């Protein structure tokens, strides 16, 4: 049973899963539109949106927390310079997940992840 | 929560120091004994020149357990040791002093002497 439990496994160890979602968040913040599998896309919200929420207040402690979470100076700079001021007045829901058919190699269901006000 | 093969300290001056439980009395297939329950014990260590000797098979009553007991308000009381008190063939205490605290589960006509002799009842 898994009554009321949250989180995913995705056939990975916990550290590998955490690193993979870190990489996905960095790629999404850089490019503002990515394509991945549907379960990864749905779980990516719970990791990426709190980072944008944190970036709404620009302090040394918040920047250091963001650096601990992402390990990417360019991502920290973009978060605290562009994305946070952009979403200052938006109450959550900074991402958009859209189904995008299936993948040729393994028939895996796919999806697009997009920032809400990309362009 | 005392079962067969459990070692127990002795909380009196009958002469035994360590006993081992060899049977939990009071029913077929009964597993555990708690405070106020009667057990059969074998004497593993004893004071020299005492009345009880090493290798004797006697009855005993459990007075303290590490598993602890429940109270009606939902609390639990736990001790640091498992301790027993030696009884005769008529299931009456045969000691004249009690060491350490006991609990109010012993306030019966069978074990009133332990209550009256114990340094503390909690």
């Amino acid at each position: 049973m898994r009554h009321r439990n949250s989180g995913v496994k995705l056939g990975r160890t916990s550290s590998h899963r955490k690193a993979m979602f870190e990489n996905l968040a960095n790629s999404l913040f850089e490019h503002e539109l990515i394509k991945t599998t549907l379960p990864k896309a749905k779980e990516l919200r719970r990791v990426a949106e709190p980072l944008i929420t944190l970036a709404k207040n620009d302090t040394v402690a918040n920047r250091r927390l963001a650096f601990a979470r992402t390990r990417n100076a360019a991502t920290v700079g973009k978060l605290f310079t562009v994305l946070g001021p952009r979403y200052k007045e938006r109450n959550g829901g900074y991402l958009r997940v859209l189904k995008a058919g299936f993948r040729a190699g393994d028939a895996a269901p796919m999806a697009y992840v997009e920032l809400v006000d990309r362009e | 929560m005392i079962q067969t093969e459990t070692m127990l300290d002795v909380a009196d001056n009958s002469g035994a120091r360590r006993v081992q439980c060899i049977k939990v009395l009071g029913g077929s297939h009964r597993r555990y004994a708690s405070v106020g329950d009667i057990i059969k014990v074998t004497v593993k260590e004893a004071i020299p020149r005492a009345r009880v000797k090493k290798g004797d098979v006697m009855n005993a009553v459990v007075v303290r357990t590490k598993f602890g007991i429940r109270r009606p308000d939902g609390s639990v009381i736990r001790f640091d040791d498992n301790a027993a008190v030696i009884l005769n063939n008529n299931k009456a205490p045969i000691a004249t002093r009690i060491f350490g605290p006991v609990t109010r589960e012993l306030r019966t006509e069978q074990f009133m002497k332990i209550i009256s002799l114990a340094p503390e009842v909690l």
Binding site: - | R64, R71, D73, G74, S75, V76, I77, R78, F79, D80, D81, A83, F99, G100, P101, R104, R107, P119, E120, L122
Partner: protein, 117 residues
């Protein structure tokens, strides 16, 4: 407040309104009501608070003491009417919420430093 509002409302009507502030590492005296037949009396339980659970009506705290060379712990339910009164005798200085490490210490090693204003 992790329960449904109706459950919270039912629990709230039973809360005690005069509990003192106390923390793990303190030494306290708890007065317990003892009923024998019709004889009512108060018995003191004095010792060190080694654990405290804050859950509203389901709050509890564990007190440990040494009695005639035997260690004894009791887990008091904070809002039960059986607990008549709680006195804080001394305030301790500790570094963690749960002090189970005191169970393996004796005498001098188990001393708790006093918290000094």
């Amino acid at each position: 407040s992790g329960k449904h509002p109706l459950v919270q409302a039912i629990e709230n009507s039973q809360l005690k309104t005069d509990l003192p502030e106390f923390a793990p590492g303190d030494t306290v005296v708890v007065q317990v009501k003892v009923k024998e037949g019709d004889r009512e009396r108060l018995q003191a339980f004095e010792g060190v608070v080694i654990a405290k659970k804050n859950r509203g009506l389901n709050s509890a705290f564990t007190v440990r003491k040494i009695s005639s060379g035997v260690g004894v712990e009791r887990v008091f339910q904070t809002h039960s009417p059986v607990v008549a009164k709680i006195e804080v005798k001394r305030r301790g200085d500790v570094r963690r919420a749960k002090l189970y490490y005191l169970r393996d210490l004796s005498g001098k090693a188990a001393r708790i430093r006093e918290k000094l204003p």
